[PDB]
């Protein structure tokens, strides 16, 4: 894979550490440009980290913290753009990678051989009692010319004194004791006021649009682009989607035009991303923009005619920006809502809260608000749910959890600590992006019965699961799917919970035969749904009772025939 999405967990103890290694692999393996923040936290000594090998670029910040690991192999990493920064100021953060209390553990050598560039932000290296050479580096050289206010705060306390760097290095400047870890300079050595260079001479100066240095003066030859890679060439802006006429200023669509996606000019946006009016590939539309689905591809954003007719916002958006959970003080905002622009979080607060005081608990019946809901643009998180409810049937008609905002930057569907006995998400047929985490739900069966592969939309995605009721003991009680669930796939017991109903449907229920020849109301079939006839159509003996729904389309009228209808 070319690109991957990063995270935003940021020093939080991961709620199931047994998963945590699997998540990092699924997310960062194969990938070369980490869009988001590269967060390697709470990693054990042994941890196989070979999946981080190919990382060349980090859009955001790099956080290596609370790790017992001997070394992290980010050797190919050439640039961090610092799109956001840890603790407001730090593009790189190496914190608390020791043993507190083979022989020792903790971070020994940094090994950032290639890390030539840090556009925005500073560096923070503290409390790493086996970390060496942190001292030696000329950090000033690594920061870009523009930010260079870019402060550093390096702590140098150790429990071993270190080797010197291999004498091959010019000054004592290295990422490790090996000769191949000498910190070759780029910025602070060049001729004139060069952005960056491959050597101290004028021919050795890089193009204005190169970033992490270069292998020659051309705009092709950059180790990374400052602004955008345009089909092999570094440029300041992508070719716009629309040319304008000399006189009229009409939209003459650019044959060679591209969209901005990260640091790349792109012919069309990736799967879950929204095409923008301006021509970007965003995950949330701009101000004065409306989310629209067109007949041409995915959803796109648009400059509105009227101050865009408001559509039901969720958490992490507009007036619920910094609310952590759906509670009894905002449950009735979601009434009647077909689609929620944002996310939903259910916490132990929401059901057992009275903290801040006076705010009443949510009742199980108040949750039926969401029965209308078909789509969530963001994530679903549930760390708490009432005991009385055995499932998440409230979200029965939830179909698409897109996850353009993901929990801790990773998890779209998060279910933890619940005591629900089956899932119930019977309409759920897509997980747009992000990982699914279902864990420590003591009672939950019907997890090994959902074909999660069919929900996912890119190879990074996966389900992670532990400490739920195991399917050996579920099937031990004899809890299979219902007969009529094709390929035995279901979200719970009974005939309502199939993913594909193998025969015929009656609203919720999967069914062998409709009531076309015998039964209570007589029924016409349409797209495998048993829909009743008009009630005033006559019941027939050994025959079809109607063409369709209405009274004009009966075989015979039961009481009065007055065309065009029966009555």
């Amino acid at each position: 894979t070319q690109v991957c999405t990063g995270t935003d967990m940021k020093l939080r103890l991961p709620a199931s550490p047994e998963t945590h290694l699997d998540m990092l692999r699924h997310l960062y393996q194969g990938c070369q440009v980490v869009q988001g923040n590269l967060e390697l936290t709470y990693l054990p000594t042994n941890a196989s980290l070979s999946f981080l090998q190919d990382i060349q670029e980090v859009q955001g910040y790099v956080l290596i913290a609370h790790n017992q690991v001997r070394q992290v192999p980010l050797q190919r990493l050439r640039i961090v753009r610092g799109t956001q920064l840890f603790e407001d100021n730090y593009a790189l953060a190496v914190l608390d990678n020791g043993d507190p209390l083979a022989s020792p553990g903790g971070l020994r050598e940094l090994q950032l051989r290639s890390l030539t560039e840090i556009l925005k932000g500073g560096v923070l290296i503290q409390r790493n009692p086996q970390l060496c050479y942190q001292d030696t580096i000329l950090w000033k050289d690594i920061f870009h010319k523009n930010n260079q206010l870019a402060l550093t705060l390096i702590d140098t306390n150790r429990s071993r004194a270190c080797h010197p760097c291999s004498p091959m290095c010019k000054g004592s400047r290295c990422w490790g004791e090996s000769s191949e870890d000498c910190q070759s300079l780029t910025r602070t050595v060049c001729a004139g006021g060069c952005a960056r260079c491959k050597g101290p001479l004028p021919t050795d100066c890089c193009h204005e649009q190169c970033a992490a240095g270069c292998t020659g003066p051309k705009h092709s030859d950059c180790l990374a682009c400052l602004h955008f890679n345009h089909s092999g060439i570094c440029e300041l802006h992508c070719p716009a989607l629309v040319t304008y006429n000399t006189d009229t200023f009409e939209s003459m669509p650019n044959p060679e035009g591209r969209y901005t996606f990260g640091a790349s000019c792109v012919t069309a946006c990736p799967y879950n991303y929204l095409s923008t009016d301006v021509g970007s590939c965003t995950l949330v539309c701009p101000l004065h923009n409306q989310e629209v689905t067109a007949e041409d591809g995915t959803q796109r954003c648009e400059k509105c005619s009227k101050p865009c007719a408001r559509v039901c916002y969720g958490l992490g958006m507009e007036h619920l920006r910094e609310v952590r959970a759906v509670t009894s003080a905002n449950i009735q905002e979601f009434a009647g809502c077909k689609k929620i622009f944002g996310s939903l979080a259910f916490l132990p607060e929401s059901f057992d809260g009275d903290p801040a005081s006076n705010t009443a608990p949510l009742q199980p019946e108040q949750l039926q608000v969401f029965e209308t809901l078909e789509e969530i643009t963001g994530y679903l998180y549930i760390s708490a749910w009432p005991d009385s409810l055995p499932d998440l049937s409230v979200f029965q008609n939830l179909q698409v959890i897109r996850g353009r905002i993901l929990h801790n930057g990773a998890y779209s569907l998060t279910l933890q600590g619940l005591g629900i006995s089956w899932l119930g998400l019977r309409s759920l047929r897509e997980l747009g992006s992000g990982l699914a985490l279902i864990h420590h739900n003591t009672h939950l069966c019907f997890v090994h019965t959902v074909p999660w592969d069919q929900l996912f939309r890119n190879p990074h995605q996966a389900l992670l699961h532990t400490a739920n009721r195991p399917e050996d003991e579920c099937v031990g009680e004899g809890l299979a799917c219902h007969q009529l669930c094709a390929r035995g796939h279901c979200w719970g017991p009974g005939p309502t919970q199939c993913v594909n109903c193998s025969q015929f449907l009656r609203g919720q229920e999967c069914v062998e035969e409709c009531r076309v020849l015998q039964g209570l109301p007589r029924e016409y079939v349409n797209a495998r749904h048993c829909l009743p006839c008009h009630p005033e159509c006559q019941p027939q003996n050994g025959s079809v009772t109607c063409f369709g729904p209405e009274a004009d389309q009966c075989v015979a009228c039961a009481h009065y025939k007055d065309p065009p209808f029966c009555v």
Partner: antibody
């Protein structure tokens, strides 16, 4: 004032060796980018080699590469040149010249008197 | 290899008359980063080593009098001497310090017309 006095020139049989040594005075030698320019008798000027202030950057011409080795001792205000596998072609004056500002611009602003090196059996 | 061309090889002029020497380079010597051409000019007076006349293709060194002035840009340059004096006798060289290998031109021999 500025002064570069070079030594160790003279006669060498083809294939043999010789070591030039240029002694600097009247500036902080640690902050300047030294070089050797040679001149065969009644010919133009040929760049031989260059070395940066701290010795962290070295270069050679293709005609001399491998055969010649440049070096310096900043503590002892001196610049050296180890010419091995010498040839008739290498016969020339060898001017020791100081550059401009450490390792960026090779102006050559002050030149030595130069030492004559002859290669004949 | 930035190959250096000088023309002419001989110049013979009466002192007081002005005189000029063109330098050409196979690849450009203009540096965008500091907006200067990275050429240098020297006078090798006979029975002496070379002396630096000009750096940055147009800026003089300390000691070098008014008459000596470099000009041009890109690949094509011209060293000028307004009012040649009888001691200016020598050979004039152009060097580039744009990149390895650092190359000189052939030289231009200036004769005083006595």
């Amino acid at each position: 004032e500025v002064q570069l006095v070079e030594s160790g020139g003279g006669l060498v049989k083809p294939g043999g060796s010789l070591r030039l040594s240029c002694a600097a005075s009247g500036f902080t030698f640690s902050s300047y980018s030294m070089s050797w320019v040679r001149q065969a008798p009644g010919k133009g000027l040929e760049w031989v080699s260059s070395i940066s202030s701290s010795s962290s950057y070295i270069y050679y011409a293709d005609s001399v590469k491998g055969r010649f080795t440049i070096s310096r001792d900043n503590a002892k205000n001196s610049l050296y040149l180890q010419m091995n596998s010498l040839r008739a072609e290498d016969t020339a004056v060898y001017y020791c010249a100081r550059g401009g500002d450490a390792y960026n611009y090779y102006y050559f602003d002050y030149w030595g008197q130069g030492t004559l090196v002859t290669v004949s059996s | 290899d930035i190959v250096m061309t000088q023309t002419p090889l001989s110049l013979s002029v009466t002192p007081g008359q002005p005189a000029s020497i063109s330098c050409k380079s196979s690849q450009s010597v203009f540096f965008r980063s500091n907006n200067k051409n990275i050429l240098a000019w020297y006078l090798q007076k006979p029975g002496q080593p070379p002396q630096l006349l000009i750096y940055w293709a147009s800026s003089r060194e300390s000691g070098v009098p008014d008459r000596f002035s470099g000009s041009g840009s890109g690949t094509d340059f011209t060293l000028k001497i307004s009012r040649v004096e009888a001691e200016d006798v020598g050979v004039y060289y152009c060097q580039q310090y744009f990149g390895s290998p650092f190359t000189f031109g052939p030289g231009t021999k200036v004769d005083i017309k006595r």
